[PDB]
Amino acid sequence: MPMQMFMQVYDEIQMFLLEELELKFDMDPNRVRYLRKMMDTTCLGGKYNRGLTVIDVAESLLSLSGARRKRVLHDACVCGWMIEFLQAHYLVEDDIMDPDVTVQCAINDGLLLKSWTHMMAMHFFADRPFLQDLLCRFNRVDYTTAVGQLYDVTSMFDFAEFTLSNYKRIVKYKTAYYTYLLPLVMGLIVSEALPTVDMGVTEELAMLMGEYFQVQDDVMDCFTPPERLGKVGTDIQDAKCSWLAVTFLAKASSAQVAEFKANYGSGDSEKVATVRRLYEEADLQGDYVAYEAAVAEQVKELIEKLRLCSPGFAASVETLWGKTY
Amino acid sequence: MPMQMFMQVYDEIQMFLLEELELKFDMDPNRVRYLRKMMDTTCLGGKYNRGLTVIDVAESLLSLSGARRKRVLHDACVCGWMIEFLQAHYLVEDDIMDPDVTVQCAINDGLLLKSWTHMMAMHFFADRPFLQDLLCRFNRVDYTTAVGQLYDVTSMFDFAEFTLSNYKRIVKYKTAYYTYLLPLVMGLIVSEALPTVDMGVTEELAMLMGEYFQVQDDVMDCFTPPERLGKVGTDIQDAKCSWLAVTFLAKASSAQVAEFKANYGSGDSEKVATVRRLYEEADLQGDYVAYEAAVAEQVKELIEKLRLCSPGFAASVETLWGKTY
Numbered sequence: 001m002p003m004q005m006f007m008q009v010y011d012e013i014q015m016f017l018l019e020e021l022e023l024k025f026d027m028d029p030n031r032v033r034y035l036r037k038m039m040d041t042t043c044l045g046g047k048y049n050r051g052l053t054v055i056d057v058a059e060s061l062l063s064l065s066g067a068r069r070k071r072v073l074h075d076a077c078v079c080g081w082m083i084e085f086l087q088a089h090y091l092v093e094d095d096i097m098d099p100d101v102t103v104q105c106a107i108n109d110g111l112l113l114k115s116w117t118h119m120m121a122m123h124f125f126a127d128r129p130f131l132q133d134l135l136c137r138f139n140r141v142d143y144t145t146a147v148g149q150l151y152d153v154t155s156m157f158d159f160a161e162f163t164l165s166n167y168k169r170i171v172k173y174k175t176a177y178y179t180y181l182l183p184l185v186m187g188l189i190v191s192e193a194l195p196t197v198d199m200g201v202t203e204e205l206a207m208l209m210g211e212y213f214q215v216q217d218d219v220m221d222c223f224t225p226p227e228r229l230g231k232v233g234t235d236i237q238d239a240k241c242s243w244l245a246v247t248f249l250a251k252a253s254s255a256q257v258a259e260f261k262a263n264y265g266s267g268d269s270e271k272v273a274t275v276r277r278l279y280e281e282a283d284l285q286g287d288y289v290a291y292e293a294a295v296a297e298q299v300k301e302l303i304e305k306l307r308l309c310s311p312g313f314a315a316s317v318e319t320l321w322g323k324t325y
Numbered sequence: 326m327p328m329q330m331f332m333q334v335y336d337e338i339q340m341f342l343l344e345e346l347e348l349k350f351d352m353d354p355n356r357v358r359y360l361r362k363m364m365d366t367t368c369l370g371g372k373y374n375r376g377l378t379v380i381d382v383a384e385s386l387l388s389l390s391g392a393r394r395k396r397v398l399h400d401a402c403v404c405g406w407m408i409e410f411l412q413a414h415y416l417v418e419d420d421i422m423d424p425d426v427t428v429q430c431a432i433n434d435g436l437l438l439k440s441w442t443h444m445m446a447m448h449f450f451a452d453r454p455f456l457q458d459l460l461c462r463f464n465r466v467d468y469t470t471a472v473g474q475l476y477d478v479t480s481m482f483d484f485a486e487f488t489l490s491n492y493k494r495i496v497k498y499k500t501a502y503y504t505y506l507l508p509l510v511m512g513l514i515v516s517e518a519l520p521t522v523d524m525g526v527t528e529e530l531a532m533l534m535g536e537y538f539q540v541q542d543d544v545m546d547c548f549t550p551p552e553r554l555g556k557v558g559t560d561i562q563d564a565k566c567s568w569l570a571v572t573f574l575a576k577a578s579s580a581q582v583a584e585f586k587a588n589y590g591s592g593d594s595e596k597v598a599t600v601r602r603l604y605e606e607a608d609l610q611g612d613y614v615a616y617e618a619a620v621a622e623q624v625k626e627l628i629e630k631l632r633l634c635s636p637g638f639a640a641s642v643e644t645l646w647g648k649t650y
């Protein structure tokens with residue numbers, strides 16, 4: 001029922017965006033169908049975990065607080081697609097990083113997806129009292145992610161920033177603010193329950209779940225094979241500031257660091273194999289299990305602290321925590 | 326005095342944006358100075374014609390309608406820099422069209438410049454009654470330009486769209502809505518005189534000045550040498566939908582069209598020279614003078630129509646019209 005409603009609102013959002021281009025933007029049907037195929041290619045495909053979280057938060061607050069129910073659940077789907085659309089916007093900008101007409105259309109697709117988030121927000125929420133407050137928080141979170149992508153890309157151009165605290169800063173700005181905080185806030189805004197929750201504990205629960213997911217995603221990037229992971233692990237070649245790197249540099253000898261600095265960030269499949277060997281000679285996967293368990297306990301405890309002031313909110317957070325755990 | 330005020334507000338805007346990153350975004354000084362050098366590189370350099378137009382409109386309405394004057398002129402400079410910042414955002418996206426770290430930073434610079442337009446608007450206008458109305462019109466004009474760039478880039482991928490009307494559509498959405506309409510609207514919004522002007526005539530005057538500038542810029546792209554123009558003319562090689570092309574196809578014989586379709590859009594310097602030869606054998610520059618004079622007369626007449634309902638507004642439009650003419 002939630003997913004069935006989510007894809008139905010996608011038809012409602014896509015119809016408005018394309019018809020507006022046909023009627024009020026003087027666009028020919030050829031480019032209109034071109035944008036339909038482009039929208040479905042970029043927005044549809046993933047698991048929609050960021051969007052469906054907004055719905056799960058909204059349905060918990062209306063029943064754990066008749067015509068008002070249909071409005072909030074509809075606003076949640078529009079807010080959920082705002083994230084999925086902006087998620088596709090960043091993914092299109094990633095394909096560029098990896099008279100040419102296929103690159104010009106790629107940049108244009110990224111600008112349109114970003115613009116469509118404002119169009120659907122200024123439309124379905126034109127009469128909502130939170131349109132001005134939602135767009136401001138939505139922009140700063142988009143600003144935060146662009147800043148976080150600067151922390152991550154320039155993590156080796158200025159090993160001085162290979163610290164567990166800087167790793168927290170990257171995951172916080174690059175990932176945690178858009179995955180584990182943004183959908184929770186948009187669920188409280190459509191339900192008109194934003195000031196009725198502990199934002200400090202909500203923020204604290206957001207960064208910890210991002211730390212839990214990013215660390216697990218770094219171990220799978222290095223150890224899970226490409227057929228079981230679904231992608232080719234390139235964090236070692238890209239010299240990324242992963243959890244495996246900052247943990248290795250702390251418990252490695254002065255030689256294992258020198259052998260690490262001479263083999264890290266190289267495309268040689270044998271140097272990367274020498275880096276994976278050092279990661280296992282350091283028993284990092286042993287520390288990986290205990291590290292996630294420590295963060296997992298902090299998640300379970302902070303859910304109870306937010307439960308004393310927001311009972312129905314914690315039920316949705318436990319569901320979001322169950323997705324990563 | 327206007328330009329001296331404009332660069333002074335740039336210091337005020339840059340100081341807020343960078344300090345916010347240092348205090349509320351946990352950014353190290355290395356990246357802060359990196360963003361200062363990047364901001365000055367992209368935003369500073371041009372003639373600032375789009376930004377200064379907002380100031381020229383604001384100063385005409387406060388004297389041709391004491392503490393209220395300083396507020397409107399300050400809002401005009403912030404609104405003027407919103408355009409210059411977003412202008413640099415599109416320019417950065419153009420350099421991309423023409424683990425690599427120099428391309429990742431290019432995409433990141435484009436996202437930050439776009440985000441900074443919202444940050445400076447949500448800051449300096451946090452207490453203005455037009456913050457919600459300005460951001461909505463600012464986004465749709467940004468949406469319009471991204472749509473116009475789709476009309477222009479795909480003008481030969483779907484010579485069927487090489488018509489004088491489609492040329493108007495490209496210039497309208499790609500150029501006229503951001504150069505000759507956006508600065509005029511932001512000047513009326515900061516002066517609280519938006520509903521006191523004929524928007525239809527204001528829109529009509531906007532597209533005509535864009536048509537006047539784009540046509541003149543197409544002739545210089547083909548005939549003005551690179552040292553006098555300042556750039557290498559590549560519209561013929563790129564197979565652009567320029568005014569010289571749509572005018573040629575209308576007055577060329579069935580052979581001159583075949584010789585045009587076989588030499589247009591090619592990088593061969595001899596095929597391009599064969600296209601320039603056809604442009605002069607058709608006496609297009611003779612039609613170019615009379616075409617601009619016809620549009621120039623429509624500009625002078627529409628200034629009088631807006632003068633009957635807005636006297637001080639026309640004085641600023643005549644100044645903006647004097648920049649292109």
Ligand SMILES: Clc1ccc(OCCCn2ccnc2)cc1
Pocket residue numbers: 082083084086087090091094138139141142145178182
């Ligand atoms: Cl407000 C908002 C901010 C960021 C969003 O997505 C982040 C995607 C970044 N990314 C992920 C993989 N490659 C790039 C969605 C909404």
Ligand SMILES: Clc1ccc(OCCCn2ccnc2)cc1
Pocket residue numbers: 407408409411412415416419463464466467470503507
């Ligand atoms: Cl709202 C707004 C919309 C568009 C703006 O700039 C248009 C620049 C497009 N361009 C020009 C040369 N290459 C790309 C500024 C403000």
